[PDB]
Ligand binder design. Structure first.
Ligand code: NA
Length: 121
């Protein structure tokens, strides 16, 4: 049907907007602390602490599989990156401090992407 194609043109457009958003969020992690999953060879107990790990490459794979159905799902994954890090690491660590900075700086980007997703439909 033509109705499923017009849908898929929009999902494709949403994928295109979210790709831009992701690149801007990741530019706020120049240390690349959140780039890749936490290593289970290096932190073997990690899953005892964190039930839903998340990182930027894992979000990218989902994105390129058009697996985000809306901005809310994308944001949830971004928040997991931050919240996991803030639980697993103590307050006086470079890791915790990096997540605080990413949250604060990411807010500006997510605020404008909310408006662009509503505006464009
Ligand atoms: Na903690």
């Amino acid at each position: 049907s033509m109705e499923q194609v017009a849908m898929e043109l929009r999902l494709t457009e949403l994928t295109r907007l979210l790709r831009s958003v992701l690149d801007q969020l990741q530019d706020k992690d120049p240390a690349r602390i959140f780039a890749q999953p936490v290593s289970l060879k290096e932190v073997p107990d990690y899953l005892d602490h964190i039930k839903h790990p998340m990182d930027f490459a894992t979000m990218r794979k989902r994105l390129e599989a058009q697996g985000y159905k809306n901005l809310h799902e994308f944001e949830e994954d971004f928040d997991l990156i931050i919240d996991n890090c803030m639980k697993y690491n103590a307050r006086d660590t470079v890791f915790y401090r990096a997540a605080v900075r990413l949250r604060d700086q990411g807010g500006v980007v997510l605020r404008q992407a909310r408006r662009e997703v509503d505006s464009i439909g």
